[PDB]
Amino acid sequence: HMKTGDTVADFELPDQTGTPRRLSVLLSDGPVVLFFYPAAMTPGCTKEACHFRDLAKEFAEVRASRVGISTDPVRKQAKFAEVRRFDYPLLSDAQGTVAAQFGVKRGLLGKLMPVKRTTFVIDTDRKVLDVISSEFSMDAHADKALATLRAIRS
């Protein structure tokens, strides 16, 4: 299970337009806060992702970017981002491959299940700076990530 101080392997997944995105390119200009959520459009995931949305200026101030990720298909991620006016990428991990890399994949007798809600703050060298796990409040994912990034400011 991925933890603070581990190095994340690079990966590629499509965003809400179907365009391949790569972690190392997403990291171009600063850390990425990669937030795994179980299911697009559900009330708890909407709360978590809208809190990330509402903190756009604060993440920009620490030169960090927000990226949501789940096993939902591109077409559902597209609707979620359109309805909620998200100003950031939502990645579709349609086989749970990246979730498995991070240790957050769930399945039942071969059926891919929703991921375990977990946020990874990833530095530009792919080190994990912080992990917010599934027992935290919905707002704590963005709040703790932002506080960690502020703590490492220069």
CATH number of residue 80's parent domain: 3.40.30.10
The residues near 112 (Cβ < 8 Å, ≥ 6 apart) are 71, 95, 96, 105, 106
Angle at 88 between CA 84 and CA 90, to 5 degrees: 80
**Catalytic hit among 8, 45, 98, 104:** 45
Domain extent, residue 39, equals: 1-154
The secondary structure of residue 39, as a DSSP letter, is: S
Method: X-ray
DSSP code string of 59-77:
HHHTT-EEEEEESS-HHHH
Active site residue 50: no
Distance CA 15, CA 68 (A): 9
At 92, list the tokens: 């579709």
CA 136 to chain centre: 15
**Domains in the chain, number:** 1
At 134, list the tokens: 């599934």
Resolution expressed in Å: 1.4
Q: Is 110 exposed, middle or buried (0-12, 13-18, 19+ CB in 10 A)?
A: exposed
